[PDB]
Symmetry: D3
Subunit: 173 residues, 6 copies
Amino acid sequence: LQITETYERLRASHISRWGIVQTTYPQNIAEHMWRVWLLCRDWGAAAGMPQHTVRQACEFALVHDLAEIRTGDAPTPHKTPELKELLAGIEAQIVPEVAELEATMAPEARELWKFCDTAEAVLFLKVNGLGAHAYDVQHLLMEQMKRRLMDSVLDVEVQDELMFQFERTIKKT
Amino acid sequence: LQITETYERLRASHISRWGIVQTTYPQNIAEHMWRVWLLCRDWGAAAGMPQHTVRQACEFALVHDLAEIRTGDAPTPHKTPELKELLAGIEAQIVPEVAELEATMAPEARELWKFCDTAEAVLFLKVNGLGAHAYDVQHLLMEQMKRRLMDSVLDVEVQDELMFQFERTIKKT
Amino acid sequence: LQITETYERLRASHISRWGIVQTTYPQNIAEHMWRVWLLCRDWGAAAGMPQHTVRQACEFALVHDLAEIRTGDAPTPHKTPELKELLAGIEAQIVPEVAELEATMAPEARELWKFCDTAEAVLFLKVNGLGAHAYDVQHLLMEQMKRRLMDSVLDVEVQDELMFQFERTIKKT
Amino acid sequence: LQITETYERLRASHISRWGIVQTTYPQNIAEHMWRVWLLCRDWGAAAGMPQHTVRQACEFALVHDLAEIRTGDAPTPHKTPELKELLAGIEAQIVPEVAELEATMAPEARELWKFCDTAEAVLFLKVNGLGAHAYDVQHLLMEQMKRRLMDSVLDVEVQDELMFQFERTIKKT
Amino acid sequence: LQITETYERLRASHISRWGIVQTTYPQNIAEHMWRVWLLCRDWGAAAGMPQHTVRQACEFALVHDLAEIRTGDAPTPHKTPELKELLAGIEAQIVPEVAELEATMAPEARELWKFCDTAEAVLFLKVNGLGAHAYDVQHLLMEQMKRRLMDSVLDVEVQDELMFQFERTIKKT
Amino acid sequence: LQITETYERLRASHISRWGIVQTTYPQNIAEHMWRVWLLCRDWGAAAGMPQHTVRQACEFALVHDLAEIRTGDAPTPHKTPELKELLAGIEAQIVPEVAELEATMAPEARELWKFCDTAEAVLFLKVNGLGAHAYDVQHLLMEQMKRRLMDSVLDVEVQDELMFQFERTIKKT
Ligand SMILES: Nc1ncnc2c1ncn2[C@H]1C[C@H](O)[C@@H](COP(=O)(O)OP(=O)(O)OP(=O)(O)O)O1
Ligand SMILES: Nc1ncnc2c1ncn2[C@H]1C[C@H](O)[C@@H](COP(=O)(O)OP(=O)(O)OP(=O)(O)O)O1
Ligand SMILES: Nc1ncnc2c1ncn2[C@H]1C[C@H](O)[C@@H](COP(=O)(O)OP(=O)(O)OP(=O)(O)O)O1
Ligand SMILES: Nc1ncnc2c1ncn2[C@H]1C[C@H](O)[C@@H](COP(=O)(O)OP(=O)(O)OP(=O)(O)O)O1
Ligand SMILES: Nc1ncnc2c1ncn2[C@H]1C[C@H](O)[C@@H](COP(=O)(O)OP(=O)(O)OP(=O)(O)O)O1
Ligand SMILES: Nc1ncnc2c1ncn2[C@H]1C[C@H](O)[C@@H](COP(=O)(O)OP(=O)(O)OP(=O)(O)O)O1
Ligand SMILES: [Li+]
Ligand SMILES: [Li+]
Ligand SMILES: [Li+]
Ligand SMILES: [Li+]
Ligand SMILES: [Li+]
Ligand SMILES: [Li+]
Ligand SMILES: [Li+]
Ligand SMILES: [Li+]
Ligand SMILES: [Li+]
Ligand SMILES: [Li+]
Ligand SMILES: [Li+]
Ligand SMILES: [Li+]
Ligand SMILES: [Zn+2]
Ligand SMILES: [Zn+2]
Ligand SMILES: [Zn+2]
Ligand SMILES: [Zn+2]
Ligand SMILES: [Zn+2]
Ligand SMILES: [Zn+2]
């Protein structure tokens, strides 16, 4: 069950996202994690967040989906509290090092990472989603991202900078 | 949660299989279910199984993965007994009519359907799998299909006919 | 010429539609037949059509394009009366069992199947068509579907239910 | 019916080949005609054929499939003598200028073009065909190409040069 | 370095364009050159240009990107004067016959070819471009095409016919 | 010219590699950089290299191709010394921060990164390359990787560990 080998971790590029949504091509988790990392780096800096917080978000961004090399990627609406609890235990056996990073993340780093994780998905569908369901999913995710941010521990000035940058970025995507 | 609308059921063709395996293109559950149906029809007849059994297998083949329109398709090795139990309850809320069919299936119809479900996957990867992991998965599934068949309630003569037809078919695929 | 083997019938998923229309990916006849079957099942029931009629439409939906495993799929505008006559004889040698089903279909079952066959194509292009020609084809097919339905032997109440369901479905596709 | 507009002729790149054969991607008739043109140019010269013959083959290579913008591309085994006769009349209404070129082609130019037309297909499948059926088709076409060449009016020395070049090319493809 | 073999020239269909722009699929230089050839042929004739000029543009259209089999296709904005100078020398060693054709082209043939080369790209992105950057590139190329044409040695009546045909064609693409 | 915006850096996933090589799909530079990062992390650790060296290689791996968002990705054989010199100056204007990182990299970190950069490409083609040219490129890159490693400043024990891990990984890819 545990992932221990580089040949397995390289299969990040074999793991397809958007398994219930029509898209122009199958996005893999390697390109997704790179893009989330980029957003954490750039937007954490734009928002003036402490370097240690941005570093922690970026480190997690690069590995956060490695368990999917075994579990697959599953749709957000399907991940109810009971399923998430079961998956957290399974994921901790698959990638104990990722579980340890997750358990060490500061709340501000977690909220930066989560904002960027969802933003990347909205940005991806803006270009590559196909049809009415994909459009609805893109807009639902955007609403969920905003609600989570607004309710988070991040200072309002940080929230506003993140939304400023998100909106500038999606307009040009 | 429950799937009630034709526009949702049409998204069978938006649901991608093989989410952790490299393939030439993303196979959807609509083409998969059609092919499983075909195998049930043809091989059930070749094996001389009663018409009522073949009909029941075929009826289930056409709908068996509809819950994945919500849950996504998840990899076989990941579906442990505890996860399957949780998924069975969720799937019964998503598609109660499919759950009722599943609960009514005779053992012989279930074993025909399961043989054909796994055979279709082996046949798909034979053409469309890419790389060493996909090759291993193709061969693992073939071993699992044979072991399940050999341990099933199907008469040995039926088992032998199913394996005869499978091997003729894969040679020409 | 005659198709007799399961390995050949499995090549339904190797037969590409839309050979003269730009699309996001090459749809195969297996996913098409599954979707037409689904529409026959759901919309035949919604329209209150007799069970025997819906069953006959569904049975034909699952096999109606098997001859294309040999002939290929050819564009609707190209199928003039003289070509259709030649193709009907060739198709009857390729898949005599499908030709027998076609010759037994009741008019009401044929009109349900034909409505759903064309509706599926409109629905597919709505999501997956690319460019001005594909858009024109989508709209032409929709006009042809409506004209055929309006001129058919189906009761007006059945026609209206089919159009009600079609329009609800395309809005959400 | 007649193709008269550049916007229609540009849809050569919207016309997919190999509609009954599994391939890595859908090859269009524009890339096919370019490659056939190239083979006519290079191999006609290598074989020492008269410039006027090579020019005529090349001119036809660039337009020979334009009718498929309306008819679609249909599989070689399906094109029986009776269907070809019907298609020739339809194609002459679609693209009268191509029909006139075809009717003017010298036998030696026709045989060069036909050798290159089939060679291009073998070469394409060598790289891009998937599965056992595609492999059989690749090899069948190669046998058909050789038989037609050997029975043609081309001088044996020209036949041998064409086969020399074909075999060198496929080894490196 | 020099391209001398047919097996190499056939790799035109292995050379992908739009390497910095999101598209629905990777267009190759073989389909691009065929389409540019078509535009030169049709629009040169529509504009009443001398046959010798149209022939020269068409001949160059079919080979103009062969050096990319070695160099790759590189984005227009990246090709500054200093890079173009270096690339011209490299390209002349790769395909001396193409360099000789380029050096012999009459100004009117060059301007026809260049108009059609850029028009083909605009037309391709109109159907197959994805996202805001691709949209901007499509429109930038269209502006560049018009500016080059307006400043060229082509007679105003020829310029107007080329723009007339371009605009009719893109509306139907 | 300079890349300054997150919306531009996100287009890493719009930049296609392998522009002169046939592949099953167009790999982008985001998934490539993630995989190179992974190899630097895992194999640098396996080889016992100092943490500061592995960190520097990993940091560069994540950004090393950002200039390609403007320049495109160009084939290795095409990058002669004179072209590389011109490209280095252009790349330093496009991404000055990447140029600064490159100029600060220690030789041991550079050699780790370069080994992993080439290894990733070999590993990618092992799964996703198509045809004889792609096969030759895969094997050429592997020979080049080994020659560079053997001639590098890395200790022989580090070289041997890198080759040990590479060979174990490719066997399972
Ligand atoms: N509403 C939706 N419908 C369908 N797919 C969706 C929807 N929202 C997101 N997706 C997709 C995007 C991914 O492919 C997949 C799961 O997203 P992912 O980013 O891995 O995790 P997550 O943010 O949902 O949860 P977690 O952090 O608990 O793993 O679901
Ligand atoms: N060993 C494997 N590794 C990776 N993917 C696999 C493996 N075996 C099968 N798959 C894929 C095929 C499908 O995309 C997915 C799940 O298969 P699926 O046919 O829906 O269900 P299943 O037979 O595993 O279980 P169930 O009937 O309980 O739903 O896993
Ligand atoms: N106007 C059109 N232009 C181009 N392609 C079209 C058009 N209308 C439909 N198509 C495509 C859809 C399919 O790929 C193909 C043929 O459709 P198909 O559903 O197999 O048969 P059909 O309904 O035309 O006739 P039949 O029932 O006589 O076989 O043509
Ligand atoms: N044995 C085969 N099985 C399936 N597809 C095949 C076979 N041989 C060739 N093909 C494909 C290649 C093309 O996509 C299509 C028709 O080929 P094409 O090159 O247009 O014409 P053709 O040479 O058969 O005849 P014609 O010159 O009379 O039009 O059939
Ligand atoms: N603004 C742009 N941004 C990104 N890609 C572009 C842009 N304009 C064009 N392209 C793409 C189209 C091709 O894939 C590539 C180069 O175009 P190409 O037609 O080969 O040459 P070119 O007209 O730029 O120059 P030349 O004739 O000097 O070779 O750049
Ligand atoms: N022999 C080859 N033939 C064709 N493509 C190749 C070959 N070797 C590598 N490639 C491809 C892989 C990439 O798509 C592209 C350039 O590789 P890339 O990894 O960006 O840079 P590089 O290692 O060649 O040089 P640099 O570090 O100077 O930029 O060439
Ligand atoms: Li999807
Ligand atoms: Li995920
Ligand atoms: Li997969
Ligand atoms: Li599944
Ligand atoms: Li098409
Ligand atoms: Li069809
Ligand atoms: Li095909
Ligand atoms: Li054809
Ligand atoms: Li691109
Ligand atoms: Li180019
Ligand atoms: Li490539
Ligand atoms: Li590169
Ligand atoms: Zn994520
Ligand atoms: Zn199944
Ligand atoms: Zn149909
Ligand atoms: Zn042809
Ligand atoms: Zn060009
Ligand atoms: Zn790199």
